[PDB]
């Protein structure tokens, strides 16, 4: 089972991440999603992965929904999307 869970989804990478941005970007394209090296379009954030991002800075921007890598890794493992809102780095 290898379903393209992230079909036409979009992500951004912020703070610091693992295994590395390139590896995570490859997981995204393997599973049919897209990624960006930037986030101009705050108004249409879909996901952000950041394994370290101050919650205070997040709410000062008030436009970021940072997720820990466990979501993406485990959604890939289950070959279905999990709620990142339970594997999040939000407040």
UniProtKB/Swiss-Prot annotation:
It comes from the Eukaryota. It is found in: Nucleus; Mitochondrion. Residues 2-89 form the BRCT domain. Transmembrane segments: none annotated. Interacts with REV7. Belongs to the DNA polymerase type-Y family. Deoxycytidyl transferase involved in DNA repair. Transfers a dCMP residue from dCTP to the 3'-end of a DNA primer in a template-dependent reaction. May assist in the first step in the bypass of abasic lesions by the insertion of a nucleotide opposite the lesion. Required for normal induction of mutations by physical and chemical agents. Involved in mitochondrial DNA mutagenesis. Present with 521 molecules/cell in log phase SD medium. This is DNA repair protein REV1.
């Amino acid at each position: 089972m290898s379903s393209k869970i992230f079909k036409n989804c979009v992500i951004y990478i912020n703070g610091y991440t693992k295994p590395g941005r390139l590896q995570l970007h490859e997981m995204i394209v393997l599973h049919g999603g897209k990624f960006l090296h930037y986030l101009s379009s705050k108004k249409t954030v879909t996901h952000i992965v950041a394994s370290n991002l101050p919650l205070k800075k997040r709410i000062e921007f008030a436009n970021y929904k940072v997720v820990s890598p466990d979501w993406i890794v485990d959604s890939v493992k289950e070959a279905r999307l999990l709620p990142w809102q339970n594997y999040s780095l939000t407040s």
